[PDB]
C-alpha cells in the first residue's frame, strides 16, 4: 500500500533557455516572438495606401506624362513607392524641401486636384512650350499640371496672376523657375536677361533668380528646372509675379491631414486586405510584443528585435521515464501516464492503481503562468509609428542620427527581451519545482508516522489504505487518528 507524488511528462521536444541552462526540454512552451506575416500590402485601419509604383511623388504632382494618369484615391493612410522610381523629373532639375513635402502628404483626409489658374488666361505669354525630355509618342510635351511661360513674339511682359483659396481646405501649390544653358537661350525664351520669379502669400515670400551654367545633358537637356511648394491657407491669396523664367502651376491640391505616416518602399501592390501593422514584406496580425520581420514598419507594431527565437516556458521540465530539489531531483522522473494535470498522485492498493492529478495545485499553476504570459504581452505599450524616413544627400548627418537612434532601440529591446525570457524561464521551472515540493509536503505532514518516507516521492502505508482512504489523502482530509493502532506495529 503506497501513494506517490509525481508530475507530467509528454512527447514534447520543445526547448527553451534559462539563465542557468541551455536547450531545456519542456512539456509546454509559447513563442512570444512574431515571425510571420501575410505577404500582402493591406489597408491600414480601413484606409488604403496611395500606390505610386514606378513614379515619384514629384513626377506625379507635377504631372510627368508617365505619371499624370495615375489612379489616385481621395484618401490614403500611407504611401508605397519603389526604391528608385523610374519616372520623376522628366525635365531634369531639383525640388526644394522635397522630403518635407513627401512627409506632408504621407497621410491625408482628403486630397483633391483643382484647376486654379486656367492656362489659357496667360493672354500675354506663350504657353504651349514643351520639351523632348517629356516626349510621349513622341512629340515634345511637359509636366501636365504646369505651364511653361515663354515670350510672345519678341515680348515677355511681366506675368502677374493671383488665386484666392476659396476651396474650403488648405491647398498645396507648386511652382518652378527655369535655368537655361546660356544667355542666348535666356533671351530666346524670355527675351530679357536679369529676371525673377516671385511668389507671395500671407506667410510665404519667395524670390528666385535664374542661375545659368554650362551643364552636361540629363535626359538630353542641359537646362534645369527648380521647383518649390507652399501650403495656401483657406481664404488666403497667392501672388505670382515674374519677369521671366516662371514655371506656373495650373493646378493646386486641396488637402486635409489626420496626422502623419511614412513612405514604404516595396514592389508589392494593395490587396483586399486589412491590417494594423504593415511591413515591406507583408502585414502583421499579432498580439505578441516582439517581431523580427522587418525594421521599416508602419502602424501600431510590436517591437522589432534581432533574435530569431523568444520562447517562454509554460509547462515544466519534460523528463520522460531546480531550486526545490523535487523535479528531476528526489522524484527523478515524470509520469508519461498522467494526462489530467501537471502534478498528482499514483497509488497502489488491493483495489488497484493509480494515476490521479491534483486539480487544485494544477489550477493554481495554470492561473499563475497565464498571468506571467499575459504580463509580458499586455504591458507592452504600442502607438502608431512609421519607422522609415526620407533624407537628401546633404543630410547624411541627420540620416545617421536617425540610424543610431533606431540601432540604439534595437539593442535595448533585443538585450532586454532575451534576458527577460532567460530569467522568467528559470523562475518558471522553479515555480513548478516548488509546486511539486509543496504537494509532497501536504502528503507528508498529513501522514507523519502512519507511513514511511520511501524516498523518490513515495509513501509506504503502515495500514490498509483503500480507495476512499487514498482520496482523503489526495484532498487533504486524511484521518490520522483513525489509523493509529495498525502503525508499524503500534
Ligand X SMILES: CC(=O)N[C@@H]1[C@@H](O)[C@H](O)[C@@H](CO)O[C@H]1O
Q: Which residues contact ligand X by CB under 6 A?
A: 164, 166, 216, 235-237, 468, 471-472, 475, 477
Task: Quote the least distance from Cβ 69 to its own copies, whole Å.
Answer: 28
Task: Tell me which residues in 342-361 interact with its own copies (CB under 8 A).
Answer: none
- 318 contacts its own copies (rule: CB under 8 A): no
| Contacted by 431, from ligand X, its own copies, none: CB < 5 to 8 Å by type | its own copies
Options 45-53, 55-63, 351-359, 410-418: segment touching its own copies (CB under 8 A): 410-418
Task: Give least dist CB 181 to ligand X, A.
Answer: 14
User: Does the protein bind its own copies through residue 479 (CB under 8 A)?
Assistant: no
Out of 94, 109, 126, 472, name the contact with its own copies by CB under 8 A. 94
Q: Which of 129, 130, 329, 333 binds its own copies (CB under 8 A)?
A: 329
Angle at 85 between CA 83 and CA 90, to 5 degrees: 155
User: At closest approach, how far in Å is the CB of 394 from ligand X?
Assistant: 23
Site residues for its own copies, window 173-192 (CB under 8 A)?
A: 179
10 Å Cβ neighbour count for 269? 11
Beta-ladder partners of 152: 155
The smaller minimum CB distance to its own copies, of residues 282 and 284, is found at: 284
92 phi, psi to nearest 5 deg: -65, 155
CB of 36 to its own copies, least distance (A): 23
Nearer to its own copies, 8 or 303 (CB): 303
Q: How far is the CB of 45 from its own copies (least distance, A)?
A: 18
**Whats the size of the chain, residue-wise?**
490
- With CA atoms as reference, report the closest residue to 195 among 185, 205, 131, 118: 185
Q: Give yes or no for residue 385 binding its own copies (CB under 8 A).
A: yes
Residues 240-279 that bind its own copies (CB under 8 A): 241, 260
Among ligand X, its own copies, none, what does residue 472 contact (CB within 5–8 Å per kind)? ligand X
The interface partner of residue 107, options being ligand X, its own copies, none and the CB cut-off 5 to 8 Å by kind, is none
Amino acid at each position: 500500500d503506497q501513494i506517490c507524488i509525481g508530475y507530467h511528462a509528454n512527447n514534447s521536444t520543445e526547448k527553451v533557455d534559462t539563465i542557468l541552462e541551455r536547450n531545456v526540454t519542456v512539456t509546454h512552451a509559447k513563442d512570444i516572438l512574431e515571425k510571420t506575416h501575410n505577404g500582402k500590402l493591406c489597408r491600414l485601419s480601413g484606409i488604403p495606401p496611395l500606390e505610386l509604383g514606378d513614379c515619384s511623388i514629384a513626377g506625379w504632382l507635377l504631372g510627368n506624362p508617365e505619371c499624370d494618369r495615375l489612379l489616385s484615391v481621395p484618401e490614403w493612410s500611407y504611401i508605397v513607392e519603389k526604391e528608385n522610381p523610374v519616372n520623376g523629373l522628366c525635365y531634369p532639375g531639383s525640388f526644394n524641401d522635397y522630403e518635407e513635402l513627401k512627409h506632408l502628404i504621407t497621410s491625408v483626409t482628403h486630397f483633391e486636384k483643382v484647376k486654379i489658374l486656367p492656362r489659357d488666361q496667360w493672354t500675354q505669354h506663350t504657353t504651349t512650350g514643351g520639351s523632348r525630355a517629356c516626349a510621349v509618342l513622341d512629340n515634345p510635351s511637359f509636366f501636365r499640371n504646369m505651364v511653361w511661360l515663354t515670350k510672345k513674339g519678341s515680348n515677355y511682359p511681366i506675368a502677374k496672376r493671383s488665386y484666392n483659396n476659396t476651396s474650403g481646405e488648405q491647398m498645396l501649390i507648386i511652382w518652378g523657375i527655369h535655368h537655361p544653358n546660356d544667355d542666348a537661350e535666356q533671351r530666346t525664351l524670355y527675351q530679357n536677361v536679369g529676371t525673377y520669379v516671385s511668389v507671395g502669400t500671407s506667410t510665404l515670400n519667395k524670390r528666385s533668380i535664374p542661375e545659368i551654367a554650362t551643364r552636361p545633358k540629363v535626359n538630353g537637356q542641359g537646362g534645369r528646372m527648380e521647383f518649390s511648394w507652399t501650403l495656401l491657407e483657406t481664404w488666403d491669396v497667392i501672388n505670382f509675379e515674374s519677369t521671366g523664367n516662371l514655371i506656373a502651376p495650373e493646378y493646386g491640391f486641396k488637402i486635409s491631414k489626420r496626422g502623419s505616416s511614412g513612405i514604404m518602399k516595396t514592389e508589392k501592390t494593395l490587396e483586399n486586405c486589412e491590417t494594423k501593422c504593415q511591413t515591406p514584406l507583408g502585414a502583421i496580425n499579432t498580439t505578441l510584443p516582439f517581431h523580427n520581420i522587418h525594421p521599416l514598419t508602419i502602424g501600431e507594431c510590436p517591437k522589432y528585435v534581432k533574435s530569431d527565437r523568444l520562447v517562454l516556458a509554460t509547462g515544466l521540465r519534460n523528463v520522460p521515464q531546480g531550486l526545490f530539489g523535487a523535479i528531476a531531483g528526489f522524484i527523478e522522473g515524470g509520469w508519461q501516464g498522467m494526462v489530467d494535470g501537471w502534478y498528482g498522485y499514483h497509488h497502489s492498493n488491493d483495489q488497484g492503481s493509480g494515476y490521479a492529478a491534483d486539480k487544485e495545485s494544477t489550477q493554481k499553476a495554470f492561473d499563475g503562468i497565464t498571468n506571467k504570459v499575459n504580463s509580458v504581452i499586455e504591458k507592452m505599450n504600442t502607438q502608431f509609428e512609421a519607422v522609415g524616413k526620407e533624407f537628401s544627400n546633404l543630410e547624411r548627418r541627420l540620416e545617421n542620427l536617425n540610424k543610431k537612434m533606431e540601432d540604439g532601440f534595437l539593442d535595448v529591446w533585443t538585450y532586454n527581451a532575451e534576458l527577460l525570457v532567460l530569467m522568467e524561464n528559470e523562475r518558471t521551472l522553479d515555480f513548478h519545482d516548488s509546486n511539486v515540493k509543496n504537494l509532497y509536503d501536504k502528503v507528508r505532514m498529513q501522514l507523519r508516522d502512519n507511513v514511511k518516507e520511501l524516498g523518490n516521492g513515495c509513501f509506504e502505508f503502515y495500514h490498509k489504505c483503500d480507495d476512499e482512504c487514498m482520496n482523503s489523502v489526495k484532498n487533504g482530509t486524511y484521518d490520522y487518528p483513525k489509523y493509529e493502532e495498525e502503525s508499524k506495529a503500534a
